[PDB]
Amino acid sequence: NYGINLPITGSMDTAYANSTQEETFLTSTLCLYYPTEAATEINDNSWKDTLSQLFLTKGWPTGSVYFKEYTDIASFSVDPQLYCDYNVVLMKYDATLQLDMSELADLILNEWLCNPMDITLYYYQQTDEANKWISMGSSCTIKVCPLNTQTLGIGCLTTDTATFEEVATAEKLVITDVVDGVNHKLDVTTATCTIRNCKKLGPRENVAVIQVGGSDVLDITADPTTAPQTERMMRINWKKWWQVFYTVVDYVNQIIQAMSKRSRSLNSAAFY
Amino acid sequence: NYGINLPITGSMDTAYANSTQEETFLTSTLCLYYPTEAATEINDNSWKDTLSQLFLTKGWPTGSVYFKEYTDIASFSVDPQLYCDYNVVLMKYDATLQLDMSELADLILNEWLCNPMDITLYYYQQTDEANKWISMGSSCTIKVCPLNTQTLGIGCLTTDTATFEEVATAEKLVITDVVDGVNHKLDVTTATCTIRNCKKLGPRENVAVIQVGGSDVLDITADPTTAPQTERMMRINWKKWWQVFYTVVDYVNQIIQAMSKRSRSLNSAAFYYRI
Amino acid sequence: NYGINLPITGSMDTAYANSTQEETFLTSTLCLYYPTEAATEINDNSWKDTLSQLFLTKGWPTGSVYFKEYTDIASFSVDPQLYCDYNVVLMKYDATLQLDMSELADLILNEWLCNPMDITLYYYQQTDEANKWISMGSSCTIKVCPLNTQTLGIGCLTTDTATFEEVATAEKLVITDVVDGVNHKLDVTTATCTIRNCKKLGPRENVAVIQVGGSDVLDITADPTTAPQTERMMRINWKKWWQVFYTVVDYVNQIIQAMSKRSRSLNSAAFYYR
Amino acid sequence: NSVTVRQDLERQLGELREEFNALSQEIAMSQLIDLALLPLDMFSMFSGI
Amino acid sequence: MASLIYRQLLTNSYTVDLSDEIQEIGSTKEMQYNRDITIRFKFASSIVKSGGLGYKWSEISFKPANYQYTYTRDGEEVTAHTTCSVNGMNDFNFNGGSLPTDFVISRYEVIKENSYVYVDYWDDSQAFRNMVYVRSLAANLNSVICTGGDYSFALPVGQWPVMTGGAVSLHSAGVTLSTQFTDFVSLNSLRFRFRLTVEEPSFSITRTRVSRLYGLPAANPNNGKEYYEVAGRFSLISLGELREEFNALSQEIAMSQLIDLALLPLDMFSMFSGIKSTIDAAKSMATSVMKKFKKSGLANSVSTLTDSLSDAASSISRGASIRSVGSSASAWTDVSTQITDVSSSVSSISTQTSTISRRLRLKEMATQTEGMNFDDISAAVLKTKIDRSTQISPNTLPDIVTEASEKFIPNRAYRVINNDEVFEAGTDGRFFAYRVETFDEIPFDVQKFADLVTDSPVISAIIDFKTLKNLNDNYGISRQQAFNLLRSDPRVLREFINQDNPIIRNRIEQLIMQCRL
Amino acid sequence: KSTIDAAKSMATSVMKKFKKSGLANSVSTLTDSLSDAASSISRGASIR
Amino acid sequence: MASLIYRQLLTNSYTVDLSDEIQEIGSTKTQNVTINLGPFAQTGYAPVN
């Protein structure tokens, strides 16, 4: 764009250009993410097809809607590539996996920027409430050792990782947070994990995590002070999976309207 | 047919017509719904009586308060004919029954305009975000088959229900929702179930579902976009049942004030019909 | 304002702000892509290191330059997760692999927008000279069947793929082009391949495919009418690999200057790209 | 079970409307008027489409 | 007048389809002569048993049957051949059960009131062979009752069920055309079809559950008769190159007599009156004449202007850049002003004028204007010659009519008055500016022109400048008259040509000579 | 009322009656008497 | 008013034919239509002896 230098005009012409949903029906793609269990319960070889014809009703041309199958919250969390313009991901309340779910939401619902970290040669530090370490893979196990202003351990010996502080034991997606403004020698299991240094920010004008199950929320926040509740964070009452999908279809536009179209670029949110 | 088509000319006379609780104490009835377990834990042959004398304190004449025993959320959900002017129903968080509870709340807390459906002879469709199919009974099992504009199945053969899509497996209360504006051949187990076509609307100026336990986040909408939190949806922290009732009594007016029984009455509970 | 279009005042103040290379030396990363054979011929355990010190000369701080090893044009054309701000990829003329190379160039040198395709349920069609089907993977084998306005084959039976028309036999990267405005039932070997529907456009303000050997020729037009020659398409005379790298280093800025940031990425564009 | 039904064509038909409206907000003025001084009869209307 | 007839057609084209669609379903998969007639015919049946034990029949159906005979008519022995077939038969069945020993008829045909019997007829006299052009035919025939005989179903064991009864009467209904093709030659015929009325007795199948049914079953429809007979009487009433003749035939059309016949709404019913044909020609032909129009010059063109408005009034947000010689965009003026899609040879103005003529001109007509409109001079030409030819046959009437439109009065111009200023778009070439009164010429304008054309009434300048100025000088031309001679008034024009006879009689005539096609 | 494809084929029959009556032919005559006037030649069974 | 109605007719007579031609060919052609019976068994005794 090269432009942002010159304001924009504020005159109230006052002419709303009508519809909005009639541009998105024609030009955008809708990608539905669900868990295996969801589809297994449906037990039809043509469910993706039936729903698609039903999607014409709500106004989405045949070749428009795509159906992606994550089989777990952890895998759907490791190697991320939102495929379509609009992504609405269905998540089933599994109470033991809550934080797994929180860490995954925090990634889709938000806009991320990521540079690479070399745990080997360089001990790092986070800068602000927006600098976090997002690591993900087969088995992510992160141990940390805070450094005083001398490159010396504080409660640890930068030499023996048996004195480090473990902050993640074999997760599939992890957003680690350390006391801001302190250097740390890091010890990740890079064999099965990848850890990258991300700065947060923009949010996502796409992800509309629809939650099935429970009650209760989650506060993506890392702090204790704030709790943000966004429109791209919806909830549905579980009955049967066929019902869930019927509702998602019967209210596609409502769900789409709670998102937008800016923000799609390269799939994999971590930015190297 | 007196009503509107006129305008009530405001004017801020600002005259205050004091109290309001003094008319409700004299002229209304309060019906408390609880589960069996609630009463069983109380273990007294005179608990209904003791609480009643205690209710005089809060201002409800002897013959005023009634105590109805649902033994389960499923049966209560079928037989909910609300007997009194003001109904405050006590619900105990059972985590496996949450949707059973949601479907029951959706029925009491709201209003519901329903017509009978003949699953046997005709291909039906819901019209707006307010047209839902509320079915209830012994064992409600609903299978559905969407029709294209030809009366032909879409992912199903209107001839063999083994190709239908099951959306309810033996529930006691079910509010079914299908993609709006599409005809469906329905296959309910009418032997043990009754399915009726309802149009929603007026919240209820009575029931005050008071929730015992959990941590609650009640999502009572069919959609994903909205979440409505009303005053007639209260929550109490579980200790013992005697305590729950003491609180309900100690705050009867506060609870009643969050309802207001003028729009009530109706003439029996739930449904409606205007067949 | 940054999520909308803003157009600039045209007054000739006329004051060029000097250097330009002195912001890129400080703030940008340089990623060099080469083939295995390249490094094998060099035979040193410290070549990446030696070149790095040499890179300080041209003005790139120690932790700045990265060295990525593709071992073939086919694999490289696969996991093209260009890692750094500036990417200069070294390609060694292999005459049998020309189109493999062309298809890979077409991908790096250009700005691509893709969506996923479900070959199973929906027969597709390309819209303009910019709608192409880019498929890539282990073994990409694509057979096609053009549909008349009835969903019926034209020279094929939408039922038996033995009548389809094969347009790719086991490639690692393929940019398929069909007669615009015609529906096609597609039959890819999705087991080993992935086919996606891409719209082209912007070009890349990064890569700089530097070609070793031949007497070179790259075609990036699918058509016959046009032939585009861009600055991000350079050529070097093959002597020894050490020489190639020396030159790449001795002329880093010249090569970088022929690219430049990443308009689509930079910050002031995160909306319409990034 | 085939005999019955109760609704069809509307959904696509009620739908359609919401677009007609928006599509109107652009019609010129002068260009319109004129095309109301031309006996757009039978043969005319079902020409394109 | 022509205004209607022409437009009237393109208006009623939608019909073309419906009709068109008939002949398909129905399509595959002078001199008078008389003669009482005697039609003798018979039915045939096909009876097929199922296999197995022999208690079941699979099919009992009607089959075409031939009959030949001779009869006397006017002292001559006539040899006749007939073929009888049925249509619209009804499928009945009888299921005695699924056991191998249960009597069953899977399908048996019955003709009822929704069925027809057809009898094709040919005989060896000369009037019959000379029937190849047929302008009209009616039959007055006696009815005949066809009754079913018995048919026994011989079961392997026991008592035999017997189908008995059934009857229908045959009534002559509708008369057409037809022809029989055998191994080598053809037998022309206008086979009549008999409508049926059920009669007594009803039919039943003894030993079963089938009684009191009305209609004639296929089991034994001839009831042992050698033939059925229907006799009566029938009456019959009987009767590139083209162009070169039309032209010559024009060189004679009067003048005054013509004009007039352009002040008479010669619409549909009128034009296809005079034609005298064999059958539903002029009919489906007045429809075919249509099915030609909606596929020619006049057609599409008009279909274009129409859009060029919609599209330019619908676009606007994205109105075609085009260009417009005049106040503003408006198909008529501008769309021609810009899409000067052809090229080279002379001066500016003329080119637009021209291209603005094309649309404006011919085109205008099929909508709204005054006085004798060119075409109304054309129609006159047509309804004329297409009468001084006498022809019948289909393949002619269409096209030729159409083609008349596209190629009649090759050129021609128009004018628009406004404040005593005759603006004349001399199509192809020319253009002048008047001062209405004192026939004078001042700088013409592409501008003043623009609008005043776009939305106001136009006039099909019968006589134009050239003829006019020459006329005004060697005569007089009262202010009164003149003012009419512009609106192209019928009267005032008719006068001169009818009265005076000078010039006027060339400007007119010449036009006739021009609608030569 | 009634009209089982009556007033229909009947609005058509009402037609199939017209084109076979006074108003019909007559109008069909004047029409010719013009054509035949200008065009062919005036059938001069005496004419003023 | 009457002007139309009257004239309107003689104008639309050409149609008389097309239609006329249907009921003939239409009836001259025609489909074979079905009998819907079989509500119950035909059932009888099935052997003489």
UniProtKB/TrEMBL annotation, chain D:
Coiled-coil intervals: 1-26
Cell location: Virion
Protein name in UniProt: Outer capsid protein VP5*
Full-protein interval shown: 486 to 534 of 776
From TrEMBL, chain E:
Cysteine-cysteine disulfides: C84-C146
Xref: Pfam families: Rota_VP4_MID, VP4_haemagglut, VP4_helical
InterPro entries noted in UniProt: ConA-like_dom_sf, Rota_A_VP4, Rota_VP4_MID, Rota_VP4_MID_sf, VP4_concanavalin-like, VP4_helical
Region: Hydrophobic, residue numbers: 155-175
Segments forming domain Rotavirus VP4 helical: 240-517
Ranges where the Rotavirus VP4 membrane interaction domain occurs: 30-239
Region (Spike foot): 251-517
Top-level division of the source organism's lineage: Viruses
Chain span(s) of sequence motif DGE motif: 74-76
Motif KID motif positions after renumbering to this chain: 385-387
Short sequence motif named YGL motif, residue ranges: 214-216
Cited Gene3D superfamilies: 1.20.5.170, 2.60.120.200
Localization (cell): Virion
Chain positions covered by the region annotation Spike body and stalk (antigen domain): 30-239
Protein known as: Outer capsid protein VP5*
Organism the protein comes from: Rotavirus A (strain RVA/Monkey/United States/RRV/1975/G3P5B[3])
